């Protein structure tokens, strides 16, 4: 439902159910959100702006782990947990219209939203990662539907 339909699925669903799908990307930072897709677009442009020392500052590499349970990202070098989000608390994931390599997802804290912003090591990877997040939403949904009689 407004999530990734099956013909766009990048993974055998088993890789989101019995395991996670793990990617690396640059982390640009997380931003608190007042509230469209304006939200993601606005936050993406701001977070990129914050990361420009112009040249870009040496932003950390994170490992993003995606399953039907939700999303975790940790520092790729240090391995410390930056955030673990249950999938129910994730509203959406989207690409930056201005830089298609950049992508974000939004979580529900409290009573405010946070937008977590990343830049893939490739534009192709930004598509694949967003598609994976999309698929994880749909797989979680399908598992939940079948759970209750």
């Amino acid at each position: 439902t407004a999530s990734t339909p099956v013909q766009y699925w990048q993974h055998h669903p088993e890789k989101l159910i019995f395991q996670s799908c793990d990617y690396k990307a640059f982390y640009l930072g997380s931003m608190l959100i007042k509230e469209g897709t304006e939200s993601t677009q606005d936050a993406c442009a701001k977070m990129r702006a914050n990361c420009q020392k112009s040249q870009m500052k040496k932003v950390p590499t994170i490992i993003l782990s995606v399953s039907y349970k939700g999303v975790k990202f940790i520092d790729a070098a240090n391995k410390n947990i930056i955030a673990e989000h249950e999938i129910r608390n994730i509203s959406c994931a989207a690409q930056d219209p201005e830089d298609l390599s950049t992508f974000a997802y939004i979580t529900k804290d409290s009573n405010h939203h946070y937008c977590h912003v990343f830049t893939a090591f490739d534009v192709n990877l930004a598509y694949e990662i967003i598609l994976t997040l999309g698929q994880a939403f749909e797989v979680a949904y399908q598992l939940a539907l079948q759970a209750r009689k």
């Binding site: 509203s91 298609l100 967003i130």
Partner: peptide, 9 residues
């Protein structure tokens, strides 16, 4: 570009 909403939200 790509945008997906989570039905479980």
């Amino acid at each position: 570009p790509l945008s997906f909403q989570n039905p479980l939200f």
